[PDB]
Amino acid sequence: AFAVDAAKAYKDYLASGGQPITNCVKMLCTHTGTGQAITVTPEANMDQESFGGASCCLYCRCHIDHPNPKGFCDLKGKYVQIPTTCANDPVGFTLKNTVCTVCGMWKGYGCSCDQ
Amino acid sequence: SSQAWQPGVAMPNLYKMQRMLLEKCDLQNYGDSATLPKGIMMNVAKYTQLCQYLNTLTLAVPYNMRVIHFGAGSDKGVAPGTAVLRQWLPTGTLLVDSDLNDFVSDADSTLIGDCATVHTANKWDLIISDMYDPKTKNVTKENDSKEGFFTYICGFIQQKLALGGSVAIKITEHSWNADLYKLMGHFAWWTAFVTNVNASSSEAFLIGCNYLGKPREQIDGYVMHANYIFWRNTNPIQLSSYSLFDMSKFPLKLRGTAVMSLKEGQINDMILSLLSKGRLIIRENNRVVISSDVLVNNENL
Ligand SMILES: CSC[C@H]1O[C@@H](n2cnc3c(N)ncnc32)[C@H](O)[C@@H]1O
Ligand SMILES: [Zn+2]
Ligand SMILES: [Zn+2]
Incomplete structure (x- = not known):
């Protein structure tokens, strides 16, 4: 019945004013990409930064099991696009937000499927 | 010169041809730091310039390419160089990395030890x-x-x-x-290639392009290192991050170089010529299987 809730711990730590996880690996790129959230190569547009995926995954970075039942990681081995306004906390961003399964953009940060 | 707009500087051939004695390395711009683009780590910049330079050589780039990266961890527990290599290499390239110390990585497999x-x-x-x-x-x-x-x-x-x-x-x-x-x-x-972002260090990457499995030239390594230091001692390199701002041609082109499994007796001068031009890879095309030896100790008494 007991499993550590790392996501909730980070969220609470953040809301209490804790410094976000640092040393997420930001990539150099053209910033002329598609803007989709999680891609096989950096896809930042003008309003995003692209990061190495593993370095932005709370579970990878904390050395804890992934919630996935098979333990698969959504980010490791890929690149995650973060809005430049949120790039101070890529781990918080990926953990709090969701990718649209239709268009591949972040819900509320690129997804226009509600229009 | 126009060197500041390159990713770095490669050792000029004339320096390779010298017979110098090894001296201490004293870099004129020692201690200077390049100004990195906002939020970019040194090792992302350094690996980007290394890959920009490798783009200019005749690398073989087959389907099902296999790359191994040693010394891939950082004191921060992540792998910036692996992240750049995976960006540079064609999608689907098998990438394995490794380090003495534990780190988290985007490689397909990581060995710690x-x-x-x-x-x-x-x-x-x-x-x-x-x-x-x-x-x-x-x-x-x-x-x-x-x-x-x-x-x-x-x-x-x-x-x-x-x-x-x-x-x-x-x-x-x-x-x-x-x-x-x-x-x-x-x-x-x-x-020997020096990145422009780290030009104030005696660091270089020793690049071997298209392995032949036999001596093409006899090199005395003690002298060649002396030649390398002499080059560095007499050729200050201007710190530069200029090439980091042009990423449009960065990805390594998937050339589809041919892979052939050949026995030693079959490598003739025609094969050696294709190998020399980056037009051929010789190896089996089997599964990628790796391991790390683990020393077992029971310190109970
Ligand atoms: C990227 S900075 C240099 C890296 O080389 C790694 N390294 C140094 N010596 C060895 C070794 N003998 N085996 C594996 N990794 C090593 C270090 O742990 C460090 O992360
Ligand atoms: Zn992960
Ligand atoms: Zn959508």
């Missing part, structure tokens, strides 16, 4: 090493050829680098090995 424990069943198309021990930076001691991981790397290249493959091995004034330089003469071409 001394590189000497690492074994692989398959051969590799590209070997990258950023392995370094900062204890070698002792200016109070004589600067002799180092063994340790360099002994491993020499043997690993001769045993597991596909003919046609390439390597980039980080060296410095004090972190170097004579046999590794001698092994550069077993490639169709070689150089």
Whole structure:
């Protein structure tokens, strides 16, 4: 019945004013990409930064099991696009937000499927 | 010069041809730092410039390419160089990385341990090493050829680098090995490349381009390192991050270089010529299987 809730711990730590996880690996790129959230190569547009995926995954970075039942990681081995306004906390961003399964953009940060 | 707009500077051939004695390395712009683009780590910048330079060589780039990256961890527990290599290499390239210390990585598989424990069943198309021990930076001691991981790397290249493959091995004034330089003469071409972002360090990448499995040139490594230091001592390199701002041509082009499994007796001068041009890779095309030896100890009493 007991499993550590790392996501909730980070969220609470953040809301209490804790410094976000640092040393997420930001990539150099053209910033002329598609803007989709999680891609096989950096896809930042003008309003995003692209990061190495593993370095932005709370579970990878904390050395804890992934919630996935098979333990698969959504980010490791890929690149995650973060809005430049949120790039101070890529781990918080990926953990709090969701990718649209239709268009591949972040819900509320690129997804226009509600229009 | 216009060198500031390149990703870095490669050792001019005339320096390779000298017979210098080894001297201490004194870099005029020592201590200067390049101004990195906002939020970019040194090692992302350094690996980007290394890959920008490798784009100018005749690397073989097959389907099902296999790359292994030693010294991939950082004191921060992430792998910036692996992240750049995976960005640079064609999608689907198998990428394995490794380090003494635990780190989290975007590689397809990661082995934690001394590189000497690492074994692989398959051969590799590209070997990258950023392995370094900062204890070698002792200016109070004589600067002799180092063994340790360099002994491993020499043997690993001769045993597991596909003919046609390439390597980039980080060296410095004090972190170097004579046999590794001698092994550069077993490639169709070689150089020592200094990134422009780190030009105030004696660091270089020793690049072997298109492995031939036999000496094309006989290189005396003690002299070649002396030649490398003489070059660095007399050719200040202007710190520059200029090339980081042009990423449009960065990805390594998937050339689909042919892979062939040949026995020794079949490598004629025609094969050697194709290998030399980056047009052929010789190895089996089997599964990629790796392991790390683990020493077992029970310290209970
Ligand atoms: C990227 S900075 C240099 C890296 O080389 C790694 N390294 C140094 N010596 C060895 C070794 N013998 N085996 C494996 N990794 C090594 C270090 O742990 C460091 O992360
Ligand atoms: Zn993860
Ligand atoms: Zn959508």
